[PDB]
Amino acid sequence: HQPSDTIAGLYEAFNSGDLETLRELIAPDAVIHLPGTAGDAEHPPGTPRDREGWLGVWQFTQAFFPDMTATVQDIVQTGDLVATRCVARGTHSGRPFEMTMLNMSRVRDGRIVEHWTISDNVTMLAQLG
Amino acid sequence: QPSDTIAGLYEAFNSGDLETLRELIAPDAVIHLPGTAGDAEHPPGTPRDREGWLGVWQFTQAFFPDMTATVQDIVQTGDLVATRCVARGTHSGRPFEMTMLNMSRVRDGRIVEHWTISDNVTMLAQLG
Protein backbone atom coordinates (compact mmCIF):
# COMPACT_ATOMS: atom_id res chain seq x y z
CA HIS A 1 0.00 0.00 0.00
CA GLN A 2 2.92 2.40 -0.70
CA PRO A 3 1.53 4.11 -3.87
CA SER A 4 -1.66 5.09 -1.99
CA ASP A 5 0.48 6.84 0.65
CA THR A 6 2.43 8.77 -2.01
CA ILE A 7 -0.76 10.17 -3.51
CA ALA A 8 -2.29 11.00 -0.11
CA GLY A 9 1.00 12.76 0.69
CA LEU A 10 0.86 14.72 -2.59
CA TYR A 11 -2.51 16.32 -1.88
CA GLU A 12 -1.44 17.08 1.73
CA ALA A 13 1.70 18.74 0.33
CA PHE A 14 -0.29 20.82 -2.20
CA ASN A 15 -2.69 21.95 0.58
CA SER A 16 0.23 23.01 2.87
CA GLY A 17 2.28 24.69 0.07
CA ASP A 18 5.11 22.26 0.86
CA LEU A 19 7.46 22.57 -2.15
CA GLU A 20 10.13 20.30 -0.68
CA THR A 21 7.73 17.38 -0.24
CA LEU A 22 6.14 18.02 -3.67
CA ARG A 23 9.57 17.75 -5.31
CA GLU A 24 10.32 14.53 -3.41
CA LEU A 25 6.99 12.92 -4.35
CA ILE A 26 6.97 13.93 -8.05
CA ALA A 27 9.81 12.92 -10.41
CA PRO A 28 11.25 15.93 -12.33
CA ASP A 29 10.56 14.18 -15.65
CA ALA A 30 7.06 12.94 -14.68
CA VAL A 31 4.53 13.04 -17.53
CA ILE A 32 1.65 15.26 -16.35
CA HIS A 33 -1.54 15.30 -18.41
CA LEU A 34 -3.51 18.40 -17.44
CA PRO A 35 -6.96 19.22 -18.84
CA GLY A 36 -7.52 21.60 -21.75
CA THR A 37 -8.48 24.49 -19.44
CA ALA A 38 -4.78 24.55 -18.37
CA GLY A 39 -3.75 24.84 -22.07
CA ASP A 40 -1.95 28.02 -23.13
CA ALA A 41 0.27 29.63 -25.82
CA GLU A 42 3.32 27.32 -25.54
CA HIS A 43 1.38 24.19 -24.44
CA PRO A 44 -1.80 23.49 -26.47
CA PRO A 45 -4.45 21.32 -24.66
CA GLY A 46 -3.28 17.72 -25.45
CA THR A 47 0.38 18.42 -24.59
CA PRO A 48 1.92 16.81 -21.46
CA ARG A 49 3.83 18.90 -18.94
CA ASP A 50 6.70 17.99 -16.62
CA ARG A 51 6.67 18.48 -12.81
CA GLU A 52 7.61 22.14 -12.78
CA GLY A 53 5.04 22.88 -15.50
CA TRP A 54 2.41 21.28 -13.26
CA LEU A 55 3.58 23.16 -10.14
CA GLY A 56 3.50 26.38 -12.26
CA VAL A 57 -0.18 25.81 -13.16
CA TRP A 58 -0.93 24.99 -9.52
CA GLN A 59 0.69 28.26 -8.32
CA PHE A 60 -1.28 30.32 -10.85
CA THR A 61 -4.56 28.75 -9.73
CA GLN A 62 -3.61 29.30 -6.06
CA ALA A 63 -3.18 33.06 -6.68
CA PHE A 64 -6.88 33.29 -7.67
CA PHE A 65 -8.22 30.88 -5.01
CA PRO A 66 -5.79 31.21 -2.07
CA ASP A 67 -7.86 29.05 0.34
CA MET A 68 -8.59 26.19 -2.10
CA THR A 69 -7.80 22.77 -0.66
CA ALA A 70 -8.23 19.20 -1.91
CA THR A 71 -9.52 16.35 0.25
CA VAL A 72 -9.27 12.70 -0.85
CA GLN A 73 -12.76 11.08 -0.84
CA ASP A 74 -11.95 7.74 -2.53
CA ILE A 75 -8.74 5.98 -3.47
CA VAL A 76 -8.22 2.75 -5.42
CA GLN A 77 -4.93 0.98 -6.03
CA THR A 78 -3.85 -1.89 -8.31
CA GLY A 79 -0.09 -2.31 -8.66
CA ASP A 80 1.67 0.94 -9.49
CA LEU A 81 -1.58 2.75 -10.48
CA VAL A 82 -3.63 4.85 -8.03
CA ALA A 83 -6.90 6.55 -8.91
CA THR A 84 -8.44 9.15 -6.59
CA ARG A 85 -11.60 11.17 -6.28
CA CYS A 86 -11.01 14.45 -4.46
CA VAL A 87 -13.20 17.40 -3.55
CA ALA A 88 -11.66 20.84 -4.00
CA ARG A 89 -13.16 23.25 -1.44
CA GLY A 90 -12.70 27.01 -1.22
CA THR A 91 -14.38 30.40 -1.17
CA HIS A 92 -14.43 33.07 -3.84
CA SER A 93 -15.06 36.47 -2.21
CA GLY A 94 -16.78 34.79 0.78
CA ARG A 95 -18.98 32.44 -1.32
CA PRO A 96 -18.12 28.73 -0.81
CA PHE A 97 -17.64 26.10 -3.57
CA GLU A 98 -17.20 22.28 -3.82
CA MET A 99 -15.75 20.78 -7.03
CA THR A 100 -15.04 17.16 -7.86
CA MET A 101 -11.59 16.18 -9.15
CA LEU A 102 -10.66 12.82 -10.63
CA ASN A 103 -7.03 11.78 -10.87
CA MET A 104 -5.01 8.79 -12.02
CA SER A 105 -1.38 8.45 -11.09
CA ARG A 106 1.45 6.00 -11.77
CA VAL A 107 3.91 5.70 -8.89
CA ARG A 108 7.40 4.12 -9.12
CA ASP A 109 9.92 4.00 -6.21
CA GLY A 110 7.61 6.25 -4.17
CA ARG A 111 7.46 9.00 -6.82
CA ILE A 112 4.78 10.07 -9.29
CA VAL A 113 6.03 9.38 -12.84
CA GLU A 114 2.72 9.87 -14.67
CA HIS A 115 -0.48 11.73 -13.72
CA TRP A 116 -3.83 12.52 -15.34
CA THR A 117 -6.28 14.96 -13.70
CA ILE A 118 -9.58 16.63 -14.63
CA SER A 119 -11.71 19.00 -12.55
CA ASP A 120 -15.41 19.79 -12.74
CA ASN A 121 -14.92 23.53 -13.53
CA VAL A 122 -18.45 24.12 -14.87
CA THR A 123 -20.05 22.91 -11.59
CA MET A 124 -17.75 25.28 -9.65
CA LEU A 125 -18.59 28.23 -11.90
CA ALA A 126 -22.33 27.52 -11.43
CA GLN A 127 -21.98 27.76 -7.61
CA LEU A 128 -20.17 31.14 -7.85
CA GLY A 129 -21.19 33.06 -11.01
CA GLN B 1 -15.95 -9.15 -11.10
CA PRO B 2 -16.37 -5.32 -10.80
CA SER B 3 -13.64 -4.80 -13.44
CA ASP B 4 -15.66 -6.96 -15.88
CA THR B 5 -18.86 -4.97 -15.23
CA ILE B 6 -17.13 -1.70 -16.11
CA ALA B 7 -15.39 -3.12 -19.18
CA GLY B 8 -18.84 -4.40 -20.26
CA LEU B 9 -20.37 -0.93 -19.71
CA TYR B 10 -18.03 0.84 -22.12
CA GLU B 11 -18.45 -2.00 -24.68
CA ALA B 12 -22.22 -1.53 -24.37
CA PHE B 13 -21.99 2.28 -24.79
CA ASN B 14 -19.78 1.81 -27.90
CA SER B 15 -22.24 -0.66 -29.50
CA GLY B 16 -25.38 1.36 -28.59
CA ASP B 17 -26.65 -1.62 -26.59
CA LEU B 18 -29.44 -0.22 -24.38
CA GLU B 19 -30.50 -3.65 -23.08
CA THR B 20 -27.03 -4.42 -21.72
CA LEU B 21 -26.70 -0.87 -20.32
CA ARG B 22 -29.94 -1.37 -18.35
CA GLU B 23 -28.68 -4.73 -17.03
CA LEU B 24 -25.31 -3.30 -15.94
CA ILE B 25 -26.63 -0.06 -14.35
CA ALA B 26 -29.13 -0.14 -11.47
CA PRO B 27 -32.21 2.06 -12.14
CA ASP B 28 -31.59 3.94 -8.87
CA ALA B 29 -27.82 4.34 -9.40
CA VAL B 30 -26.43 7.69 -8.25
CA ILE B 31 -24.76 9.23 -11.33
CA HIS B 32 -22.56 12.29 -10.77
CA LEU B 33 -22.15 13.97 -14.14
CA PRO B 34 -20.04 17.08 -14.69
CA GLY B 35 -21.50 20.61 -14.88
CA THR B 36 -21.29 20.53 -18.71
CA ALA B 37 -24.15 17.95 -18.58
CA GLY B 38 -26.18 20.39 -16.45
CA ASP B 39 -29.41 21.80 -17.79
CA ALA B 40 -32.28 24.22 -17.05
CA GLU B 41 -34.16 21.43 -15.20
CA HIS B 42 -31.05 19.68 -13.71
CA PRO B 43 -28.58 22.24 -12.25
CA PRO B 44 -24.79 21.49 -12.18
CA GLY B 45 -23.74 19.19 -9.31
CA THR B 46 -27.22 17.56 -9.08
CA PRO B 47 -26.89 13.72 -9.30
CA ARG B 48 -28.92 11.87 -11.92
CA ASP B 49 -30.42 8.37 -11.96
CA ARG B 50 -29.70 5.81 -14.72
CA GLU B 51 -32.26 7.03 -17.22
CA GLY B 52 -31.08 10.62 -16.72
CA TRP B 53 -27.55 9.45 -17.55
CA LEU B 54 -28.67 7.41 -20.58
CA GLY B 55 -30.63 10.50 -21.77
CA VAL B 56 -27.48 12.65 -21.70
CA TRP B 57 -25.47 9.87 -23.32
CA GLN B 58 -28.02 9.52 -26.19
CA PHE B 59 -27.63 13.24 -27.00
CA THR B 60 -23.84 12.87 -26.95
CA GLN B 61 -24.07 9.78 -29.23
CA ALA B 62 -26.26 11.64 -31.77
CA PHE B 63 -23.81 14.58 -31.71
CA PHE B 64 -20.63 12.48 -32.22
CA PRO B 65 -21.90 9.36 -34.01
CA ASP B 66 -18.43 7.81 -34.62
CA MET B 67 -17.02 8.45 -31.13
CA THR B 68 -15.90 5.44 -29.17
CA ALA B 69 -14.54 5.20 -25.63
CA THR B 70 -11.72 2.75 -24.94
CA VAL B 71 -10.58 1.74 -21.45
CA GLN B 72 -6.81 2.38 -21.19
CA ASP B 73 -6.25 1.80 -17.46
CA ILE B 74 -8.47 0.19 -14.85
CA VAL B 75 -7.90 -0.07 -11.10
CA GLN B 76 -10.00 -2.02 -8.61
CA THR B 77 -10.14 -2.23 -4.81
CA GLY B 78 -13.22 -3.93 -3.37
CA ASP B 79 -16.43 -2.60 -4.90
CA LEU B 80 -14.75 0.52 -6.42
CA VAL B 81 -13.40 0.61 -9.99
CA ALA B 82 -11.69 3.64 -11.54
CA THR B 83 -10.94 3.90 -15.26
CA ARG B 84 -9.05 6.14 -17.63
CA CYS B 85 -10.60 6.12 -21.08
CA VAL B 86 -9.80 7.78 -24.36
CA ALA B 87 -12.73 8.98 -26.45
CA ARG B 88 -11.72 8.82 -30.14
CA GLY B 89 -13.51 9.88 -33.30
CA THR B 90 -13.42 11.89 -36.53
CA HIS B 91 -16.06 14.61 -36.55
CA SER B 92 -16.72 16.20 -39.95
CA GLY B 93 -13.26 15.03 -41.15
CA ARG B 94 -11.33 16.26 -38.05
CA PRO B 95 -9.81 13.58 -35.74
CA PHE B 96 -9.99 13.93 -31.92
CA GLU B 97 -8.66 12.19 -28.76
CA MET B 98 -10.04 13.20 -25.35
CA THR B 99 -9.27 11.80 -21.93
CA MET B 100 -12.10 10.67 -19.63
CA LEU B 101 -11.77 9.70 -15.99
CA ASN B 102 -14.44 7.63 -14.28
CA MET B 103 -15.07 6.03 -10.92
CA SER B 104 -17.77 3.51 -10.31
CA ARG B 105 -19.16 1.56 -7.35
CA VAL B 106 -20.37 -1.90 -8.35
CA ARG B 107 -22.68 -4.08 -6.21
CA ASP B 108 -24.04 -7.50 -7.32
CA GLY B 109 -22.64 -6.92 -10.81
CA ARG B 110 -24.43 -3.57 -11.31
CA ILE B 111 -23.27 0.05 -11.20
CA VAL B 112 -24.86 1.74 -8.18
CA GLU B 113 -22.73 4.91 -8.15
CA HIS B 114 -20.68 6.62 -10.88
CA TRP B 115 -18.56 9.78 -11.23
CA THR B 116 -17.27 10.90 -14.65
CA ILE B 117 -15.49 13.95 -16.09
CA SER B 118 -14.27 14.45 -19.66
CA ASP B 119 -11.66 16.81 -21.09
CA ASN B 120 -14.16 18.69 -23.31
CA VAL B 121 -11.95 21.78 -23.83
CA THR B 122 -9.12 19.66 -25.32
CA MET B 123 -11.65 18.02 -27.69
CA LEU B 124 -13.09 21.37 -28.77
CA ALA B 125 -9.55 22.67 -29.47
CA GLN B 126 -8.87 19.73 -31.86
CA LEU B 127 -12.11 20.45 -33.81
CA GLY B 128 -12.10 24.26 -33.40
Residue numbers in the entry:
A (entry chain B): 6 to 134
B (entry chain A): 7 to 134
Publication text:
To improve crystallization, a number of variants were produced to reduce the surface entropy or to truncate predicted surface loops. Here, the crystal structure of a selenomethionine-labelled truncated form of IdmH (IdmH-Δ99–107) was solved using single-wavelength anomalous dispersion (SAD) phasing. The asymmetric unit comprises one copy of the IdmH-Δ99–107 dimer with the entire polypeptide chain successfully modelled into density, except for the N- and C-terminal regions. Both the selenomethionine-labelled protein structure and the isomorphous native structure of IdmH-Δ99–107 were modelled independently, giving almost identical structures that superpose with an r.m.s.d. of 0.12 Å over 257 amino acids.
IdmH is a homodimer, with the individual protomers consisting of an α+β barrel. Each protomer contains a deep hydrophobic pocket which is proposed to constitute the active site of the enzyme.
